[PDB]
Design a protein around this ligand. Structure first.
Ligand SMILES: CC(C)(COP(=O)(O)OP(=O)(O)OC[C@H]1O[C@@H](n2cnc3c(N)ncnc32)[C@H](O)[C@@H]1OP(=O)(O)O)[C@@H](O)C(=O)NCCC(=O)NCCS
Ligand SMILES: CC(C)(COP(=O)(O)OP(=O)(O)OC[C@H]1O[C@@H](n2cnc3c(N)ncnc32)[C@H](O)[C@@H]1OP(=O)(O)O)[C@@H](O)C(=O)NCCC(=O)NCCS
Ligand SMILES: NC[C@H]1O[C@H](O[C@H]2[C@H](O)[C@@H](O[C@H]3O[C@H](CO)[C@@H](O)[C@H](N)[C@H]3O)[C@H](N)C[C@@H]2N)[C@H](O)[C@@H](O)[C@@H]1O
Ligand SMILES: NC[C@H]1O[C@H](O[C@H]2[C@H](O)[C@@H](O[C@H]3O[C@H](CO)[C@@H](O)[C@H](N)[C@H]3O)[C@H](N)C[C@@H]2N)[C@H](O)[C@@H](O)[C@@H]1O
Ligand SMILES: Nc1ncnc2c1ncn2[C@@H]1O[C@H](COP(=O)(O)OP(=O)(O)O)[C@@H](OP(=O)(O)O)[C@H]1O
Lengths: 176, 181
């Protein structure tokens, strides 16, 4: 019913493995070792039932460049509810915890959604990015057309022109 | 369990009550004698603050924030240490060692390396604990592309976590306003 927030460095090895395995199975294989690396470093929202982790979402810190400013961003990764626990709105409890972190620490939240999860985020006030997305790669700005149509943002202490360019910072694997 | 007196406590920025957040900001700003800007304050936000309490006031602070440092084309997951400060009346009692015990525990548990910018005076402290001085040229991946940061050469220290870094190579931090390192 309610998620508990734990920083990566506060996860014991057993809990870390339990999280990785649950998230990985929830994605049915579509979750790579670099996707797992992207869930580390920040706050994990976790819901347990009788000692088993049944839901997870992580919010990690990065910068998103918007109109020349490198905005302090809480980026959401690894959102997953164990299959047998789906359809009980557990994801709402995960997102209440992640959005609380955003309000207290960041200028905006952001994330990359599948087409079917778009409704979930929009219903909570997240906004679909309509402008071109890019990544500040080591060679300079590079457009990321495969991620267009997947980015959502949650403004905290700003109004955003969601049809402007948005440029994430660099990492391996999927940059968004 | 004992009283935990002067053990640093790790608190995420989002879990700081407003009174504590203001005490940290005024304590760190005053500990730097005029050299800590509002952009330096922004740089302490978003991660875990290691705090040492005495009589309900913050007497020491160090924040570990997440960023990427690019090494040989690899964007390493870095815990970057900002705002390291011990209030002046409490200096010379090794409280910075208690802040660093917490900072280094956060690196081992969550990042591929710790990194920070050290004054010449503090170099010895970091080196005695195992941090390595970065000898290679530093740069930042600005929106226009890579650009050297010569003023930051000779100041960066790193704490690799089970990875091997050639500390004579180029190291390029990611972008942000104000001082990038
Ligand atoms: C997306 C996900 C986190 C939603 O979690 P949840 O707690 O089940 O969400 P909800 O209960 O609010 O249901 C969301 C939708 O899931 C679907 N659903 C309902 N019961 C389900 C079940 N028993 N089995 C599978 N899917 C189900 C419905 O389409 C529902 O839509 P609606 O609420 O508008 O009617 C979860 O399906 C999951 O982990 N999916 C795989 C990982 C993934 O895609 N994560 C999101 C990446 S952006
Ligand atoms: C750097 C700092 C955090 C060290 O904290 P600390 O808990 O006082 O550290 P230590 O007790 O290990 O003392 C460090 C050195 O300070 C010196 N010192 C002792 N008392 C001191 C005082 N009252 N004021 C200044 N320096 C003092 C000694 O040279 C000591 O070295 P020693 O133990 O080899 O004799 C603290 O001086 C500080 O807050 N400085 C201002 C902010 C800053 O520069 N931050 C660090 C950025 S790299
Ligand atoms: N794989 C695991 C990851 O999955 C999601 O993120 C990814 C999106 O799903 C991708 O979207 C693509 O796949 C969707 C679903 O098939 C399509 O709808 C969409 N048009 C496609 O572009 C997008 N390109 C990258 C992004 N990292 C989670 O948020 C992320 O935490 C998790 O690590
Ligand atoms: N200003 C407030 C900040 O100060 C330190 O970091 C700054 C270093 O002090 C700078 O270094 C310069 O000043 C040192 C001390 O005089 C000299 O030794 C050195 N050779 C100089 O280049 C460096 N260029 C940027 C770095 N952000 C703290 O770590 C940081 O958390 C805090 O926000
Ligand atoms: N070694 C120290 N360096 C600087 N401040 C100190 C040190 N030891 C004690 N203090 C402070 O000096 C003050 C008096 O110390 P105590 O609280 O330990 O008093 P006590 O001996 O009567 O039990 C306290 O500050 P405060 O009144 O502003 O809260 C205490 O924190």
């Amino acid at each position: 019913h309610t998620a508990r927030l734990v920083h990566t460095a506060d996860l014991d090895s057993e809990t870390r493995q339990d999280i990785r395995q649950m998230v990985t199975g929830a994605f049915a294989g579509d979750f790579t070792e670099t996707d797992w690396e992207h869930t580390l470093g920040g706050m994990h929202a976790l819901i347990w039932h009788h000692g088993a982790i049944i839901a997870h979402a992580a919010v990690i810190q990065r910068r998103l460049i918007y109109r020349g400013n490198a905005l302090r961003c809480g980026y959401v990764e690894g959102v997953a509810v164990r299959a047998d626990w789906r359809g009980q709105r557990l994801v709402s409890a995960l997102l209440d915890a992640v959005e609380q972190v955003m309000r207290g620490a960041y200028q905006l939240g952001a994330l990359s959604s599948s087409a079917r999860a778009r409704r979930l985020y929009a219903s909570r006030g997240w906004l679909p990015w309509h402008g071109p997305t890019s990544v500040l790669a080591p060679t300079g700005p590079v457009r990321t057309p495969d991620d267009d149509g997947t980015v959502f943002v949650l403004p905290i202490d700003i109004s955003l022109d969601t049809s402007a360019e948005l440029m994430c910072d660099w990492r391996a694997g999927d940059v968004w």
